Amino acid sequence: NVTIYDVAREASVSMATVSRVVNGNPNVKPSTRKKVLETIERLGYRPNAVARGLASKTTTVGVIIPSNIFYAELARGIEDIATMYKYNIILSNSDQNQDKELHLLNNMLGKQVDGIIFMSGNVTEEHVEELKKSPVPVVLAASIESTNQIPSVTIDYEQAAFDAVQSLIDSGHKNIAFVSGTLEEPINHAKKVKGYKRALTESGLPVRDSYIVEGDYTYDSGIEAVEKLLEEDEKPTAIFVGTDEMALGVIHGAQDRGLNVPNDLEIIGFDNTRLSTMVRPQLTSVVQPMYDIGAVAMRLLTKYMNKETVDSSIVQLPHRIEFRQSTK
């Protein structure tokens, strides 16, 4: 676990000075000795290599993650398998794709065995090519790429969309819109949009291009997008929304236009964020099983880092929908 280097950093001296103190050099300022000795005791540094190696090794895993809540459960899920697998977790918050890609080349100088679990809200194509570099195998969690060379553990977004929209239809709505995150992202253009379309097709419903409004993942775009849809000639009576945060906007814009949300306009969102229970018509919304996704992820990774069979990439766990008050 612990090197000369670790000690020298911690006591703010050079490696050569930690050795000097390890070797009992007598002309080391004794304040220096003192601090270097306490750092040694404190960190648990042994000067004997055969002992230092004996206390250590064991198979470790980097985890790159944006950590509010639905992120936390994904963590717990990973942590819980590391724990019984007796592996170790390097966790690290990264948000900016610049922060994201450093962490990659970053913990990429990891340690014994090694492998990496990655989760981002979308994919850099850069990202698809840095993953492929790293010798250690990478598993995507709650992240897709269309780059289906990267093993991924997620829900079925397209079916989850489909399922979100189906409940609207089962409830009598003909005129149902979608409010998406940035379409460029495959969660959107390639899944929730498909599932939304298909839900409409399979019940022989019109698939208007104007019922599909693109937001930016903020609460406002959410608000803007309702303004737009509410200006349509025949207005939607129900709206699927690609994330919760935008959906709070959509409920609120409607409530600002005098519309009762269940009664004039049913709304459903995605992920089951803290916010879904922080609006008043409480947002019925799609629950990913994030604990499982991180667990199953960690296992997947493991079956790679050990080199074995089974199907990757297409690991899709089930989702469900928490029906709350923003549907009838």
Q: Residue 135 contacts by C-beta under 8 Å, 6 or more apart in sequence?
A: none
Q: How was this structure determined?
A: X-ray
Q: Residue 192 contacts by C-beta under 8 Å, 6 or more apart in sequence?
A: 157, 158, 160, 161, 178, 180, 240, 242, 270
Tally of residues, the chain? 328
Structural domains of the chain sorted by starting position, each given as residue range(s) with its CATH number in brackets: 1-58 (1.10.260.40), 59-155+289-318 (3.40.50.2300), 156-288+319-328 (3.40.50.2300)
Query: Cα dist. 123→130, 211, 296 in Å?
Result: 12, 26, 21
Angle at 240 between CA 232 and CA 270, to 5 degrees: 150
Structure-block tokens of residue 195? 């599932």
Q: Tell me the C-alpha distance between 17 and 33, whole Å.
A: 9
Residue recorded with tokens 């814009």: 253
Beta strands per DSSP E along the chain: 60-65, 88-93, 116-118, 138-141, 152-155, 176-180, 212-214, 238-241, 266-269, 284-287, 315-317, 320-322
DSSP 8-state class, residue 282: P
Torsion angles phi and psi, residue 132, rounded to 5: -65, -25
Query: Cα dist. 44→6, 24, 29, 208 in Å?
Result: 10, 18, 22, 66
| Beta strands 284-287; 320-322: pairing state | antiparallel
Beta strands per DSSP E along 54-184: 60-65, 88-93, 116-118, 138-141, 152-155, 176-180
What resolution in angstrom units was achieved for this structure?
Answer: 2.5
Q: Tell me the C-alpha distance between 216 and 183, whole Å.
A: 9
